């Protein structure tokens, strides 16, 4: 009947953290 | 020892679901666009997150699902978009059926399956043309529906240390009279799959 789900929630990604990702972790 | 096509299917589906989850997050704008980098999968354009923690969360989720897929105990995997109030606003439902007996052709299995999966990716890529823009501040979760005869699901799915699974609540799943957006269906020698979106009218 009811499904399973992860207990943990996915991360919160701020507008600022995204700029860091775009700067260092993209090609 | 010998090959196990149930495992082959599980590997193909986990690889595909990772790409699909990433692309859903992009096209539904669940996270800032800046984290995504355009890439090629199944010979079609895709958008992959480069955020380390998000990628590990998605991979941890699918590592737990893989053994259930290998045993054909998964009925559907669902990517749920939740609003600030924790209420589902969109549900991308992957209905998965592995026939009890497979009849496998000899000429390039994976290549044929990958061509069929590329159509799912293309559909997801343009599903925003018919879905209403989600409210600000949405998050996502993944729901795994197991087959009625599946046994010891709660123990079998706890593959990863410090990544526990729990039974979902009614509030996690229920939508009142949602719209249905069929995206793509496929049949192959090793798996049948349907993808559709359930969208809250709100």
Author numbering:
A (entry chain B): 48 to 74
B (entry chain A): 7 to 208
Give the original sentences from the paper that presented this experimental model.
The translesion synthesis (TLS) DNA polymerases Rev1 and Polζ function together in DNA lesion bypass during DNA replication, acting as nucleotide inserter and extender polymerases, respectively. It belongs to the B family of polymerases and is composed of subunits Rev3, Rev7, Pol31, and Pol32 (24, 25). The Polζ subunit Rev7 is a hub protein that directly binds Rev1 and is a component of several other protein complexes such as the shieldin DNA double-strand break repair complex.
The structure of human Polζ is still unavailable, but we examined the crystal structures of human Rev7 in complex with fragments of shieldin-3 (SHLD3), including that with a SHLD3 peptide (41–74 aa), which we determined to a resolution of 2.0 Å to compare the binding modes of yeast and human Rev7. SHLD3 and Rev7 are two of the four components of the protein complex shieldin that plays a key regulatory role in DNA double-strand break repair by blocking DNA end resection necessary for homologous recombination. In the crystal structure of Rev7(R124A)-SHLD3, Rev7 binds the SHLD3 peptide at two sites. In one site, SHLD3 N-terminal loop residues P50 and L51 interact mainly via hydrophobic interactions with Rev7 residues A174, M160, and L173 in the safety-belt region of Rev7. In another hydrophobic interface, residues I60 and A65 in the C-terminal α-helix (αC-helix) of SHLD3 interact with Rev7 Y37 and P38. In human just like in yeast, Rev7 forms a homodimer, but the orientations of the two Rev7 protomers differ radically in the two systems.
